Amino acid sequence: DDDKLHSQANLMRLKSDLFNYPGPTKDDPLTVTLGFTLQDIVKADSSTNEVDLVYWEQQRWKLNSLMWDPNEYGNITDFRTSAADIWTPDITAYSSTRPVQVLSPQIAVVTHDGSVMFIPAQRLSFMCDPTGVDSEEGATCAVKFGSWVYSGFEIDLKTDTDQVDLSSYYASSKYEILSATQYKHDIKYNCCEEIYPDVVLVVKFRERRAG
Amino acid sequence: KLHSQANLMRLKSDLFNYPGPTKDDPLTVTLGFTLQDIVKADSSTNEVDLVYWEQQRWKLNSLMWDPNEYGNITDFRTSAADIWTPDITAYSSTRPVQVLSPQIAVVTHDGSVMFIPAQRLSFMCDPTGVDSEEGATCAVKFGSWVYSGFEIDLKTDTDQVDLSSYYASSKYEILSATQYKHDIKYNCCEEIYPDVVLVVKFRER
Amino acid sequence: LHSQANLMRLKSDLFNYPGPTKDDPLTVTLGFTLQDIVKADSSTNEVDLVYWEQQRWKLNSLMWDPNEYGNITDFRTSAADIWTPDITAYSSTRPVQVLSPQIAVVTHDGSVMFIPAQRLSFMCDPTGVDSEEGATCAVKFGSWVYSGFEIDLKTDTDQVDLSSYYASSKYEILSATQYKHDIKYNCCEEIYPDVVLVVKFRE
Amino acid sequence: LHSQANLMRLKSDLFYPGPTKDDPLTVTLGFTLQDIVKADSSTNEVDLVYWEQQRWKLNSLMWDPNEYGNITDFRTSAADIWTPDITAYSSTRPVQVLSPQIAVVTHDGSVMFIPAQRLSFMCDPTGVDSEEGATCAVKFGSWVYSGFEIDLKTDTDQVDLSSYYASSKYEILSATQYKHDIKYNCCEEIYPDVVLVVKFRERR
Amino acid sequence: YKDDDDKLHSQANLMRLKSDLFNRYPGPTKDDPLTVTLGFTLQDIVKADSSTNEVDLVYWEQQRWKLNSLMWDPNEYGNITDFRTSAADIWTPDITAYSSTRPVQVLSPQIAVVTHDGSVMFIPAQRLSFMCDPTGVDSEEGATCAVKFGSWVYSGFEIDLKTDTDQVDLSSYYASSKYEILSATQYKHDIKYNCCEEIYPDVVLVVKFRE
Numbered sequence A: 001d002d003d004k005l006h007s008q009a010n011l012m013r014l015k016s017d018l019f020n021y022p023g024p025t026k027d028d029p030l031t032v033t034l035g036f037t038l039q040d041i042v043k044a045d046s047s048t049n050e051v052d053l054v055y056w057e058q059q060r061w062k063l064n065s066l067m068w069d070p071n072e073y074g075n076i077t078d079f080r081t082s083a084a085d086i087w088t089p090d091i092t093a094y095s096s097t098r099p100v101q102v103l104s105p106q107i108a109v110v111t112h113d114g115s116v117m118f119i120p121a122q123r124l125s126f127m128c129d130p131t132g133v134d135s136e137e138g139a140t141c142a143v144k145f146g147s148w149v150y151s152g153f154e155i156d157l158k159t160d161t162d163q164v165d166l167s168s169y170y171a172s173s174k175y176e177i178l179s180a181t182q183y184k185h186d187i188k189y190n191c192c193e194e195i196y197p198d199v200v201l202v203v204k205f206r207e208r209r210a211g
Numbered sequence B: 001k002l003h004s005q006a007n008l009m010r011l012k013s014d015l016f017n018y019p020g021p022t023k024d025d026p027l028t029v030t031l032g033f034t035l036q037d038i039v040k041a042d043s044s045t046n047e048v049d050l051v052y053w054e055q056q057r058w059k060l061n062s063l064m065w066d067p068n069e070y071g072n073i074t075d076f077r078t079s080a081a082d083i084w085t086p087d088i089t090a091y092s093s094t095r096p097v098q099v100l101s102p103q104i105a106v107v108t109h110d111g112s113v114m115f116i117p118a119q120r121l122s123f124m125c126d127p128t129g130v131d132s133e134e135g136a137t138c139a140v141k142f143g144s145w146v147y148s149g150f151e152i153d154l155k156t157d158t159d160q161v162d163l164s165s166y167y168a169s170s171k172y173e174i175l176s177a178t179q180y181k182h183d184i185k186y187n188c189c190e191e192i193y194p195d196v197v198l199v200v201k202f203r204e205r
Numbered sequence C: 001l002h003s004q005a006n007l008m009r010l011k012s013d014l015f016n017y018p019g020p021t022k023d024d025p026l027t028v029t030l031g032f033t034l035q036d037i038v039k040a041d042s043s044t045n046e047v048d049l050v051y052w053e054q055q056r057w058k059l060n061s062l063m064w065d066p067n068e069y070g071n072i073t074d075f076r077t078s079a080a081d082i083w084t085p086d087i088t089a090y091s092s093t094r095p096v097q098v099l100s101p102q103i104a105v106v107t108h109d110g111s112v113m114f115i116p117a118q119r120l121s122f123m124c125d126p127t128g129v130d131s132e133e134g135a136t137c138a139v140k141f142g143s144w145v146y147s148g149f150e151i152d153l154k155t156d157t158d159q160v161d162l163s164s165y166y167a168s169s170k171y172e173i174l175s176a177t178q179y180k181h182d183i184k185y186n187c188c189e190e191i192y193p194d195v196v197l198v199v200k201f202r203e
Numbered sequence D: 001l002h003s004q005a006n007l008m009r010l011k012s013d014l015f016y017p018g019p020t021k022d023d024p025l026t027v028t029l030g031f032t033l034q035d036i037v038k039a040d041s042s043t044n045e046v047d048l049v050y051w052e053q054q055r056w057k058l059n060s061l062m063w064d065p066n067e068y069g070n071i072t073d074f075r076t077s078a079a080d081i082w083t084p085d086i087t088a089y090s091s092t093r094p095v096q097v098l099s100p101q102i103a104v105v106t107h108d109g110s111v112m113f114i115p116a117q118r119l120s121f122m123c124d125p126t127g128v129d130s131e132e133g134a135t136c137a138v139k140f141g142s143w144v145y146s147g148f149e150i151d152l153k154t155d156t157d158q159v160d161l162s163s164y165y166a167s168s169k170y171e172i173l174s175a176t177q178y179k180h181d182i183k184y185n186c187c188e189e190i191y192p193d194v195v196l197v198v199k200f201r202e203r204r
Numbered sequence E: 001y002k003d004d005d006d007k008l009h010s011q012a013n014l015m016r017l018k019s020d021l022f023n024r025y026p027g028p029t030k031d032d033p034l035t036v037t038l039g040f041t042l043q044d045i046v047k048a049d050s051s052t053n054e055v056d057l058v059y060w061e062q063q064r065w066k067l068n069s070l071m072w073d074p075n076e077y078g079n080i081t082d083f084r085t086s087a088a089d090i091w092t093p094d095i096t097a098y099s100s101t102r103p104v105q106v107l108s109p110q111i112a113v114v115t116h117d118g119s120v121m122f123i124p125a126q127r128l129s130f131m132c133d134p135t136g137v138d139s140e141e142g143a144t145c146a147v148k149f150g151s152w153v154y155s156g157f158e159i160d161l162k163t164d165t166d167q168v169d170l171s172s173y174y175a176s177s178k179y180e181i182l183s184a185t186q187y188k189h190d191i192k193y194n195c196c197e198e199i200y201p202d203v204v205l206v207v208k209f210r211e
C-alpha cells in the first residue's frame, strides 16, 4: 500500500515532467496508423441516401516528446491521459452528413517509447445510396478518412491491415456484413507536389432478411 | 454553524489545493444498476432505450481525513468535476449517453466515493419476441474504456439488478434483470478485461 | 453612478458556501406553475410538460445591511454566481431543457428566489387521455444527493398554479397537486423528501 | 497599425452589474420575421425564424473618440458585455441561435445586438387551412426585471416583413409587435412586454 | 542524431513562430478594412422537406483573408513558410447563412492554414438547413433555391466580400445523391437592410436541382 503511494507519486511527477507539440511539418513528418472495428450498421435511409455506422477508430502515433525512462519513474511503462492533454491528429470522414457523435471517453494511452494509442467509438452518418440492400447481392457504400489539412508529407497515414475487424459486429443487427475493407489510397492533385493519403472504409451489406 | 462551514471549506481546500490508477496503484470500482424504465424498443434499427441509475463506488487514500481534525465532519458533497471519476462506458451504445441527474458525488472520510448518475442509453438490441409471452432478451456490457483489470478491478455487490424503482406503467415489463461480472483475456498475456454485463428479459406489458 | 458602485461593492463583498450539512441544514421551498402539456406519447409512455419551478432558500452568508450599501435591498445575479440546490425530477426520460435566463434574486435578509422555466419529458402512461376521466400521471421532484437531514423540502400550497396554463393546449388539466412525501430508496440509508406533481389531464 | 492599437486600448480601458431602480435602462426591441417554418397541430407548437433587434445605452460604455484615434464604434463578443434577459414567455424549446453572437458598441454608449433565432412556442394552428388563417401570439420581456429597471420601447408596432420568405409554406396576413405596460393590482411596479401577434395561413 | 536534432530544431522554430505571433487582432474597421474571399464546393443535397420548405445541404466553404499581423520572415524561423493552427487561435470572419432554419453544423476540424505573407485559408465542411421550396424537384425542370452568405455585423466598408469565380465547384458532388445538380452559381450582391444605414455585401448560392 506504501508501494501504491509511491507509484502514484511517480505518475504525478512524470505527468508534470511531460506536460508542465505544434503538430507535424514537412521537416518533421508524423506517421499515423489507423484501423477500424465495425460494430453496427444501425440505419440505412433511402429517402436521403444516408447510412449510420457505429465503429471504433484506432489511431496510433509516436512522439519523441512523450518518451521517458521507466527506471527514472518507478517502472511506470504507460499511463492514461485526457485526449485534451495532448496533440491529436485531425483525421476526418470526408463525406459525413452530420457531426460525428463520440460514444466513448476521450482518453489516450501513452507508452514510455512515446507512442500514443487513442480509440474513439463513433456513430457516423455518411453519404450512401443503399439501393440493393434488400437483395442477395446487397448494397455497397464507402467513406474516406484522412487528415483535413495535412498532406502525406506531413501525416503519413498507414494501416496494419486491409481488413476491417468484424469480430465485434453485432450479431443481431438489422444488416449483415458481406465484407468490409480499409484499403489505403493516394491522390496526386494538380495544385500540389505533395501526395494525399486516405483510408477508405468500404462496406458491403444487406438486410438480414434479404439473404 | 459558521464554524462547521469553515471546517468544511477548510477540508475541501486541504484536499483539493489523482492521476488515475496504474498496475502498481490499482483501484477497485464497484458497479450496480437500478433499472427505472425501458422507454423505447425500435425494431426498425434494433436499438433499445433504457433509463437507469448507475451506482459507482471506489476509494482513494488521497481523499482520507481524520474527522476529529475537521470538526467531526465525516462526509461531504462535491461536484464530480472536482474529483477523479472512473471512465465507465457502455460497450454497445448507439448514441452518446444522456445524463439525467446532477453530477455530484459523496466523499466519506475513509476516502470512499459514491456517485450515482441517472442516464438514458440507446444500445444495440433486437427486440424480436417482445410481443410474446417469452419476451425478448438483450444485453449490454459496462466497463472501463481504457483501463484493464490491472488498473481498474471491476466488482459487483450483487447480481440482482434493483427493480424496486421500475416504472410500473412502462410500455415494457421486466421478466428478469441480472448484472454479471464477466471478463475476457487473451491467452498470450496476463491482462484481464472485466465488465459488468447487464442482461434484461422484457416484454410488452 | 454611485448606485452602480454600491452594487459592484456589495457583490464583491458577498462573492469575494459549501452547501448544507446535517449540522447546518437548509430549507428549500418549491412551487410549480404548469404552463403546458405539450405532447403525450403512447408509443413510449412519455409526456412533455412546460412549467416554472419556483425555488426559495435563505443563507446567512448572503445577508447584508442595506444602509451599508446605499439602501440596496435586493439584486439580480446569475444563478452560476451562487450555490443552488440540486432539485431534480426523479423520472425524467431526457435531460431537462431550460427555457428561461438563469438569474436569481437575492434579498438583504439572505433569501434567494430562483424561478427557471423548463421543458421536461417524463414517464407517464397517457391511457385514458381520450376519455372524460382522463389520464393521471405523477413525477417526483427532490434533491438528488441530499437527505431530509440536509435539505428540508417544503411547499407553500398543495395545489399546482394553473393560472398561466395555456388555454389552447391540446390537453386540458382536470387537476394538479403538489404534495410532499418522504421515501427511503434501496441505495441509501437516509430518507429523502420530495414534492410529487400529480396531474390529471385529457384531450 | 496605430488604429489597431487604439482599438485594443479602448477595449482594455472599458473592460456592469445590470440596471437598478436607481440606474434604469431602456431596451428598444423589434422583430424581423423571416419564416414560419412549421405549424404542428398534434402538439400546438409553431416554429418561427426571426431577427430580434435589441438596442440599449450604458453610460459606462461611453468614450470620447478624440481620446482614441477618432474611433466611433466597435464590434465585440456579446459575452464581453452585459446583455438584457429578454425572453419569450411561452417558448416550448430552448431558442436556437442562428447568427454569430456579436454586438456593436458606439461611443455614445449605445449597444446594438441582433440575434437571429428559431423559436418554438405555444400556438394552436386551427384555421391555418382557411381564408381567415390562424392567429398566434407570444409575449417577450425581461424574465427578472420590472419596468423600474428595464423599460421596453419599440420603434414601430409593425413587424418587419421585408425579409419574409416568399415561398414559405405559410403566408403572413399580418404581424404586429405592440408594446404593453401592465400594472398588477398587487404591486407598484409596472411590467412591460412586447407581444408578437401573427396571423397566417397555408400559402395557396 | 543529426536527423533527430533537425526535427527538434524545426519544432522549436514553429513553437517560437506561434509564440511570437499569438503570445505577443480586433477585427476590421472602416480605417483598416479586410477583403474576405469566399467560394463554395457543394458535396450533397441530403434532404428536401416539402412539409416545411427546408432543404439540407453539405458543402465546404473556402474562406481566405490576409493580415499584416500574421506576416513573418521565413529566414527568421528556419525557413517555415506556412503552418496549421486551430481556428480558435486566430480571428475569423463572421460569415453566416442569412436564411438558415437550424444552427449550422460543422463536420470537419476547424483548423486554418497560415502563410508567411499573412494570408489565412480556412475551409470548414458544414451541414445547413435553409429556407427552400422544393416544388418541382420531381420534374425535368427541377426546383430552384438560393441562400445568401455574408458577414452578420460588418458592412462593406469593413469586410469587402469577394469570390474567385461565379461557379460553385461541383467536382466533388456525391454521384449517388437523391438529387441531381442542374446548376450552381455564387454571384455577389450588395444589399441595404432596414436595420442599418450601411450596404452589406453577400455571396448568393443559387442551386437548381432535381430528383
Ligand SMILES: CC(C)Oc1cncc(N2CC[C@]3(CCCN3C)C2)c1
Pocket: B104, B105, B106, B114, B115, B116, C090, C142, C143, C144, C145, C146, C185, C187, C188, C192
Ligand atoms: C449516499 C448518499 C449520501 O449519496 C448519494 C449520491 N448520489 C445519489 C444518491 N441518491 C439517493 C437516492 C437518490 C435516488 C433519487 C434521487 N435520490 C435522492 C439518489 C445518493
Ligand SMILES: CC(C)Oc1cncc(N2CC[C@]3(CCCN3C)C2)c1
Pocket: D102, D103, D104, D112, D113, D114, E098, E150, E151, E152, E153, E154, E193, E195, E196, E197, E200
Ligand atoms: C448596425 C451594425 C453596425 O450592427 C449590427 C449588429 N448586428 C447585426 C447587424 N446586421 C446588419 C444587417 C444584418 C442582417 C443580415 C446580416 N446582416 C448583415 C444584421 C448589424
Ligand SMILES: [Mg+2]
Pocket: A002, A003, A006
Ligand atoms: Mg515507501
Ligand SMILES: [Mg+2]
Pocket: E005, E006, E009
Ligand atoms: Mg541541435
